[PDB]
Scaffold this active site. Structure first.
Site, mmCIF file in Angstrom:
data_model
loop_
_atom_site.group_PDB
_atom_site.id
_atom_site.type_symbol
_atom_site.label_atom_id
_atom_site.label_comp_id
_atom_site.label_asym_id
_atom_site.label_seq_id
_atom_site.Cartn_x
_atom_site.Cartn_y
_atom_site.Cartn_z
ATOM 1 N N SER A 29 0.843 -1.176 0.000
ATOM 2 C CA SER A 29 0.000 0.000 0.000
ATOM 3 C C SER A 29 0.894 1.247 0.000
ATOM 4 O O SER A 29 0.758 2.139 0.835
ATOM 5 C CB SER A 29 -1.000 -0.033 1.161
ATOM 6 N N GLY A 30 1.832 1.267 -0.947
ATOM 7 C CA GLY A 30 2.569 2.472 -1.312
ATOM 8 C C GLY A 30 1.752 3.265 -2.327
ATOM 9 O O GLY A 30 0.519 3.290 -2.246
ATOM 10 N N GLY A 31 2.441 3.890 -3.290
ATOM 11 C CA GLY A 31 1.841 4.810 -4.279
ATOM 12 C C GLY A 31 0.589 4.347 -5.018
ATOM 13 O O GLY A 31 -0.296 5.170 -5.294
ATOM 14 N N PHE A 32 0.519 3.042 -5.337
ATOM 15 C CA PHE A 32 -0.639 2.443 -6.077
ATOM 16 C C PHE A 32 -1.969 2.505 -5.298
ATOM 17 O O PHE A 32 -2.972 2.950 -5.845
ATOM 18 C CB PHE A 32 -0.378 1.012 -6.648
ATOM 19 N N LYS A 90 -6.771 -4.112 -6.568
ATOM 20 C CA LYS A 90 -6.603 -2.781 -6.063
ATOM 21 C C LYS A 90 -7.960 -2.113 -5.822
ATOM 22 O O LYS A 90 -8.842 -2.136 -6.663
ATOM 23 C CB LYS A 90 -5.815 -1.960 -7.056
ATOM 24 N N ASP A 150 9.700 -6.140 -7.047
ATOM 25 C CA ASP A 150 9.840 -4.860 -7.753
ATOM 26 C C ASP A 150 11.300 -4.496 -7.873
ATOM 27 O O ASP A 150 12.152 -5.044 -7.179
ATOM 28 C CB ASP A 150 8.984 -3.713 -7.163
ATOM 29 N N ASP A 162 5.231 8.382 -14.339
ATOM 30 C CA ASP A 162 5.734 7.979 -13.021
ATOM 31 C C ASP A 162 6.562 6.725 -13.162
ATOM 32 O O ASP A 162 6.405 5.750 -12.436
ATOM 33 C CB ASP A 162 4.588 7.814 -12.004
#
Ligand SMILES: O=C(Nc1[nH]nc2cc(-c3ccc(O)cc3)ccc12)C1CC1
Length: 272
Positions: free
Chosen positions: A13-16, A34, A95, A134
């Site tokens: 639950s970072g940027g996405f 998501k 990642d 991004d």
């Protein structure tokens, strides 16, 4: 939904957003689910059939037709106060940030393979009418068995156009100097900057600029051993004047981009 997919634990639950691991019932296909609140969506758009959805969904649909180096949208839903996105999930996966963090700077042969795949995926987006905005290590996944890079998070994207962009909600340390100084940029050339930042990251194990004085300075110091040619390309991609930067073509005919390894070979040579 609940009978068709089964929701498992939470991925990131970072940027996405809030993304969970899922398994599609019918065929046990791995997925990523998501969710997004409607209150937190700053950026809306319309589908081909003229439905009002999040731009993320819009852009995802456009890039999802065909095989490519991009995580595909398989399905999506509307709820009272959210939208749900069903996405591909490679397994095993990691990642590019964690990959680089664990293993240091990547060897050039590896960086080349990866960087090319990134390039290719990004050209796909542009051909599809979508500008990611991004591009970075955190938004690139690695299928560790197949050696395949996939591009993620269209939460800051936009339709690709040939005029100027005045807005940008991406990563500051990946953002080009035309945005720093003038809050104005064009898509491709901005995109190329980020790939310069990305390439550097792969070969140096860290981004080249922390502050703005550094960005708008346009002096690349190399902390690690990088071949004369790879530096030439990096410095080209990070040319201060947007018009002096290479095109995607020019990048891929650069001497440093030659004799790329296959994805599969890359896996055998650098991942197994
Ligand atoms: O990234 C991982 N698993 C994953 N699989 N598929 C994903 C899709 C997304 C994703 C999210 C938003 C979007 O517009 C497009 C793709 C994020 C994460 C995904 C992790 C941490 C190891």
């Amino acid at each position: 939904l609940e009978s068709q997919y089964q929701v498992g634990p939470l991925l990131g639950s970072g940027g996405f957003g809030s993304v969970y691991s899922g398994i599609r019932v019918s065929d046990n296909l791995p997925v990523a689910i998501k969710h997004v609140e409607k209150d937190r969506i700053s950026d809306w758009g319309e589908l081909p059939n003229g439905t009002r959805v999040p731009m993320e969904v819009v852009l995802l649909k456009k890039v999802s037709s065909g095989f490519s180096g991009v995580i595909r949208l398989l399905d999506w839903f509307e709820r009272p106060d959210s939208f749900v996105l069903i996405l591909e999930r490679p397994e095993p996966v990691q990642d590019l940030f964690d990959f680089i963090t664990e293993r240091g700077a990547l060897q050039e042969e590896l960086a080349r393979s990866f960087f090319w795949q990134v390039l290719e995926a990004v050209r796909h987006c542009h051909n599809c009418g979508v500008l990611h905005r991004d591009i970075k290590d955190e938004n690139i996944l690695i299928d560790l068995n197949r050696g395949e890079l996939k591009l993620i998070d269209f939460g800051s994207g936009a339709l690709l156009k040939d005029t100027v962009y005045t807005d940008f909600d991406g990563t500051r340390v990946y953002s080009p100097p035309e945005w720093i100084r003038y809050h104005r940029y064009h898509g491709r050339s901005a995109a190329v900057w980020s790939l310069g930042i990305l390439l550097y990251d792969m070969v140096c194990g860290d981004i080249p600029f922390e502050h703005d004085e550094e960005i708008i300075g346009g002096q690349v110091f190399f902390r690690q051993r990088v071949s004369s040619e790879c530096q030439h390309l990096i410095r080209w991609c990070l040319a201060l004047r947007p018009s002096d930067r290479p095109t995607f073509e020019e990048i891929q005919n650069h001497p440093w981009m030659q004799d790329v390894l296959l994805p599969q070979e890359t896996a055998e040579i650098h991942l197994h």
